[PDB]
Amino acid sequence: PISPIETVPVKLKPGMDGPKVKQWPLTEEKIKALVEICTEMEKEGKISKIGPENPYNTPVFAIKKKDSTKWRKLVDFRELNKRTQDFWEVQLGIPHPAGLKKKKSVTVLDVGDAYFSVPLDEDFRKYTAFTIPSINNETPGIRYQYNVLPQGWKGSPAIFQSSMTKILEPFKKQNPDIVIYQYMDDLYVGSDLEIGQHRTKIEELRQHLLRWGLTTPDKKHQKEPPFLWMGYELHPDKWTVQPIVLPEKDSWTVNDIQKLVGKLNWASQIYPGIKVRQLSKLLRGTKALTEVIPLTEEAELELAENREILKEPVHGVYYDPSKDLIAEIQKQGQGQWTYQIYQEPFKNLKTGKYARMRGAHTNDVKQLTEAVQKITTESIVIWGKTPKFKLPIQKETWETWWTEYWQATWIPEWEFVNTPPLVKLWYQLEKEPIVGAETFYVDGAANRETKLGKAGYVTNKGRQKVVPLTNTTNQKTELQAIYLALQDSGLEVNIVTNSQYALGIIQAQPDKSESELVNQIIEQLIKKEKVYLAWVPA
Amino acid sequence: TVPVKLKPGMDGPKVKQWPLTEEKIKALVEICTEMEKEGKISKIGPENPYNTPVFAIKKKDSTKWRKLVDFRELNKRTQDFWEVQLGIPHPAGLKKKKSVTVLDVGDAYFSVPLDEDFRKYTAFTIPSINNETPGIRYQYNVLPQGWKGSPAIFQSSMTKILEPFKKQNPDIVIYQYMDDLYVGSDLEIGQHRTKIEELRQHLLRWGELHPDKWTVQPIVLPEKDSWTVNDIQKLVGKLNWASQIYPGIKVRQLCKLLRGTKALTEVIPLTEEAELELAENREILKEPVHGVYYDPSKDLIAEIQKQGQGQWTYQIYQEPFKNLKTGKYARMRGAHTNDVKQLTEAVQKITTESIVIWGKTPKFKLPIQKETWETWWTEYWQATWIPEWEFVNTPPLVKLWY
DNA sequence: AATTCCCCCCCTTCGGTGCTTTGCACCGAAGGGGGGG
Numbered sequence: 001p002i003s004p005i006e007t008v009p010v011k012l013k014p015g016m017d018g019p020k021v022k023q024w025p026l027t028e029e030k031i032k033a034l035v036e037i038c039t040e041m042e043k044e045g046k047i048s049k050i051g052p053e054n055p056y057n058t059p060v061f062a063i064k065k066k067d068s069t070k071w072r073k074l075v076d077f078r079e080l081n082k083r084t085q086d087f088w089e090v091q092l093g094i095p096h097p098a099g100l101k102k103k104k105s106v107t108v109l110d111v112g113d114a115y116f117s118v119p120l121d122e123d124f125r126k127y128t129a130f131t132i133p134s135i136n137n138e139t140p141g142i143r144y145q146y147n148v149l150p151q152g153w154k155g156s157p158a159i160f161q162s163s164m165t166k167i168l169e170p171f172k173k174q175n176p177d178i179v180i181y182q183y184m185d186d187l188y189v190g191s192d193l194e195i196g197q198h199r200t201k202i203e204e205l206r207q208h209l210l211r212w213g214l215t216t217p218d219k220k221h222q223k224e225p226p227f228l229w230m231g232y233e234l235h236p237d238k239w240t241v242q243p244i245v246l247p248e249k250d251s252w253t254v255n256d257i258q259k260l261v262g263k264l265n266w267a268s269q270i271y272p273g274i275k276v277r278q279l280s281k282l283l284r285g286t287k288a289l290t291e292v293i294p295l296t297e298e299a300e301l302e303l304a305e306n307r308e309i310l311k312e313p314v315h316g317v318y319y320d321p322s323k324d325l326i327a328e329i330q331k332q333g334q335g336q337w338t339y340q341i342y343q344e345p346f347k348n349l350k351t352g353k354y355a356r357m358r359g360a361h362t363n364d365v366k367q368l369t370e371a372v373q374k375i376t377t378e379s380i381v382i383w384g385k386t387p388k389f390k391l392p393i394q395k396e397t398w399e400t401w402w403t404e405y406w407q408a409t410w411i412p413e414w415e416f417v418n419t420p421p422l423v424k425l426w427y428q429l430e431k432e433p434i435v436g437a438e439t440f441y442v443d444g445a446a447n448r449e450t451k452l453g454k455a456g457y458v459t460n461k462g463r464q465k466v467v468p469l470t471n472t473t474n475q476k477t478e479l480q481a482i483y484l485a486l487q488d489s490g491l492e493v494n495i496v497t498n499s500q501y502a503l504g505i506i507q508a509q510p511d512k513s514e515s516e517l518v519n520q521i522i523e524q525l526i527k528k529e530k531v532y533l534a535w536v537p538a
Numbered sequence: 539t540v541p542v543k544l545k546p547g548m549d550g551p552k553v554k555q556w557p558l559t560e561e562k563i564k565a566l567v568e569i570c571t572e573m574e575k576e577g578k579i580s581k582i583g584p585e586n587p588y589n590t591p592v593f594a595i596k597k598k599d600s601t602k603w604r605k606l607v608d609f610r611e612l613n614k615r616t617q618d619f620w621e622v623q624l625g626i627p628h629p630a631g632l633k634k635k636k637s638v639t640v641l642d643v644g645d646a647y648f649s650v651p652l653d654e655d656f657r658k659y660t661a662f663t664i665p666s667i668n669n670e671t672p673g674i675r676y677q678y679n680v681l682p683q684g685w686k687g688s689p690a691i692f693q694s695s696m697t698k699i700l701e702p703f704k705k706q707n708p709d710i711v712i713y714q715y716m717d718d719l720y721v722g723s724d725l726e727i728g729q730h731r732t733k734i735e736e737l738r739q740h741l742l743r744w745g746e747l748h749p750d751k752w753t754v755q756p757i758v759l760p761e762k763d764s765w766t767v768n769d770i771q772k773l774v775g776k777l778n779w780a781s782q783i784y785p786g787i788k789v790r791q792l793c794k795l796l797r798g799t800k801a802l803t804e805v806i807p808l809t810e811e812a813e814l815e816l817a818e819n820r821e822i823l824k825e826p827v828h829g830v831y832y833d834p835s836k837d838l839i840a841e842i843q844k845q846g847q848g849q850w851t852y853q854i855y856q857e858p859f860k861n862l863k864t865g866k867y868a869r870m871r872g873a874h875t876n877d878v879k880q881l882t883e884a885v886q887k888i889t890t891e892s893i894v895i896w897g898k899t900p901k902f903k904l905p906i907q908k909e910t911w912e913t914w915w916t917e918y919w920q921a922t923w924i925p926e927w928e929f930v931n932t933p934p935l936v937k938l939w940y
Numbered sequence: 941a942a943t944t945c946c947c948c949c950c951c952t953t954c955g956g957t958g959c960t961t962t963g964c965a966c967c968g969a970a971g972g973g974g975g976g977g
């Protein structure tokens with residue numbers, strides 16, 4: 001029925017009126033369910049007939065539920081959503097099975113007709129007017145207004161969530177030894193009681209919900225494992241994702257690649273070693289969604305590896321508060337990292353990847369710090385605490401990096417694990433000039449109008465070399481001058497530059513960059529033994 | 539009830555809540571349950587479109603959790619400033635005091651009801667572990683702690699409370715900023731605690747910094763007997779940069795030795811003219827720069843640099859190259875194995891000094907990645923205020939602040 | 941050419957901002973996708 005709970009007062013934005021949109025034509029197959037649906041709701045008082053006193057209207061349509069036999073009735077409330085007051089969303093995230101604990105007895109409940117059981121504010125009801133078009137044509141359609149929360153209105157989710165929280169609070173107050181995960185109308189109820197007492201308490205909860213007009217049909221009530229909860233299969237002592245199907249097509253379009261990348265990202269939370277960079281590299285520079293993209297050799301190999309990974313079945317375990325959280329990080333190459341969070345070895349609580357490229361130039365240590373930060377945030381969200389990290393970086397390397405770096409950086413309590421490839425810095429800049437080396441005073445300029453410039457060096461021995469540069473910039477010319485100095489020098493060099501930009505780039509010790517010139521400079525810097533780079537004002 | 543209104547044309551805070559650890563969430567839940575039982579806060583719904591972040595801190599040697607609300611956006615949008623809120627912007631005698639004690643008087647704010655039309659702007663959300671339930675929304679019914687208008691409305695009551703004490707002790711300067719009371723006296727180091735205890739008893743009935751040990755750090759120059767080309771190049775660059783701060787830096791006869799390509803390692807004998815010039819330049823560098831004065835209209839900017847080995851340098855200024863204050867914060871021990879904790883302590887110390895000296899918290903240019911700070915700064919924060927900060931992503935040059 | 945809403949995530953793109961060498965680096969919002977109800 002309709003909940004006796006109090007309505008939430010809703011108002012339009014100041015100076016705005018209700019929508020007056022016209023209903024678009026609908027197929028005859030659609031206008032057999034809406035008429036069937038609207039007849040039913042009108043019987044239960046969820047919608048009310050209106051006359052000519054209401055000048056508002058809004059298009060309605062219908063889609064198919066996951067049942068594939070019922071129809072979900074939706075209203076295109078975009079115009080009303082524009083003029084509706086702002087709400088604050090109370091859903092701050094998504095529950096994860098890895099944050100669940102071992103419970104002897106588990107049940108899952110779904111509220112039937114969730115939104116249509118919560119009343120709508122009386123003064124806001126007139127703005128939800130809609131028309132059900134007549135079959136074929138003629139005989140103008142019946143006009144209704146919503147007495148309950150409509151589907152498609154931007155205020156419905158928050159209002160329903162608050163109403164459900166208010167309904168559940170009296171039950172949870174008097175039953176503190178029972179865990180209730182509440183997501184919209186989906187309720188996961190877990191307890192350590194025996195099955196008989198658990199079923200008695202579930203019946204009590206169902207009666208309490210029915211007292212507030214929230215019905216829980218037996219069709220959507222699960223009592224035996226595995227439980228289909230929030231996209232996962234929950235067993236007594238393990239959890240899995242519901243089966244993930246990857247397309248097996250021969251010709252790939254942009255939309256297909258996007259769907260595959262999204263599905264692989266979803267599957268990466270429990271399947272270890274998922275790589276997606278090569279596939280996602282095909283999505284840049286392409287405009288049309290239906291444009292066919294030939295699969296590159298690198299993308300095909302990564303797709304084959306991912307298909308290999310998904311072949312075997314993997315499972316995750318439940319959280320144990322009495323044990324310790326350990327997050328192990330592995331390098332995957334080309335700025336890709338994987339991580340496994342577990343409490344016991346070879347029993348993963350969850351898995352994940354980090355492959356975000358931040359900054360034009362960066363090294364492995366910065367990316368490892370970013371991955372640690374992401375894992376820390378995710379662990380705080382899920383379990384409420386930071387794990388102990390197993391990183392493939394030596395303690396001396398981290399000590400040198402964080403003591404010589406100009407930024408305040410930190411990694412929480414961690415220990416070194418010897419799993420190659422190891423994280424290291426590929427070169428170091430001397431803090432003092434090298435005695436007996438050769439000194440290259442490098443210069444580089446470029447006029448801003450003609451976009452031509454010069455870049456060269458002079459050494460104390462008496463060698464000079466200038467190379468004109470076309471379609472360059474002053475920063476590019478300075479970088480090119482440093483590159484010339486690195487190229488023409490020996491195994492030890494003392495480079496003196498007038499560029500703060502080039503020095504600031506080089507001092508960060510990057511090993512990958514978005515600029516090819518910086519990449520060549522890095523390759524040259526790796527070869528040398530001692531390099532001293534100094535700044536001098538022009 | 540004192541009506542409060544936002545600054546004309548402003549909307550209200552709509553800041554999202556960041557995730558919290560389990561202990562912080564448990565402490566917040568207990569504290570907010572007690573507060574709602576006592577009527578200080580009330581549960582609200584989603585029809586309130588405003589939100590501000592909340593978290594919990596354990597104050598220095600307290601073993602008791604305290605709820606802190608980040609009212610920075612609400613503070614920047616509130617007009618309640620006709621009431622200076624400080625009783626005259628700033629006692630200019632607090633900085634020249636032997637000892638200053640900071641006391642927490644924010645609980646006294648929990649007895650003054652807040653204006654009904656303004657309560658909706660004080661809404662906050664408590665999250666849940668593993669998103670088990672939707673976050674619980676509350677709004678304040680009394681004057682909140684951390685809002686700049688709370689001292690502005692309790693100001694009359696605060697002055698009434700302290701009159702029996704201030705009149706009896708005319709040699710003690712009392713300043714109020716947010717929930718903090720700064721008590722500065724020039725008495726003996728023990729008599730100061732005696733007076734502080736008397737003031738605490740007086741406050742209870744009615745319902746330690748050392749600013750004289752604060753010294754600026756002037757820009758210095760290296761002292762060497764034999765000078766190489768590299769040393770002169772590093773010194774010329776330092777003097778050229780310092781010429782922007784101290785007009786009158788010559789550095790013209792020192793650049794003559796830097797003519798012609800030359801080895802960075804070999805030594806250069808300084809000429810008598812170069813030596814004189816360097817001595818004069820050092821003489822100019824040991825005197826404080828004149829022509830710089832604090833402007834109450836403009837805001838304060840604090841820059842922090844990491845010098846390594848547990849050393850940080852900071853400059854508080856209103857205009858570039860005109861530093862109102864320069865200083866160094868050092869806490870090494872065994873490097874403390876934590877840069878974020880050191881930076882947080884430095885920020886708190888600099889903010890306390892700024893409040894004592896000018897009565898305003900500065901805007902910080904933190905030398906840290908944003909994500910690290912937002913992840914870890916709440917674990918070491920111990921102050922009831924939160925200054926505005928921005929994050930730099932550009933590395934400084936060869937640091938001249940040492 | 942089917943048209944809806946809210947939430948979290950990833951990956952790419954484009955415009956805004958700041959310091960400076962008016963280019964270059966960084967960041968946030970919006971587009972696509974995945975998942976949930």
Ligand SMILES: Nc1ncnc2c1ncn2[C@H]1C[C@H](O)[C@@H](COP(=O)(O)OP(=O)(O)OP(=O)(O)O)O1
Pocket residue numbers: 065072074110111112113114115116151152184185945977
């Ligand atoms: N596609 C959607 N568009 C808009 N709102 C939706 C959509 N899917 C779900 N919701 C919202 C409105 C629903 O009332 C609420 C609960 O979802 P769901 O249980 O699938 O529907 P329901 O409770 O109306 O039907 P049922 O009787 O099948 O349980 O979530």
Ligand SMILES: [Mg+2]
Pocket residue numbers: 110111112113114185
């Ligand atoms: Mg349902």
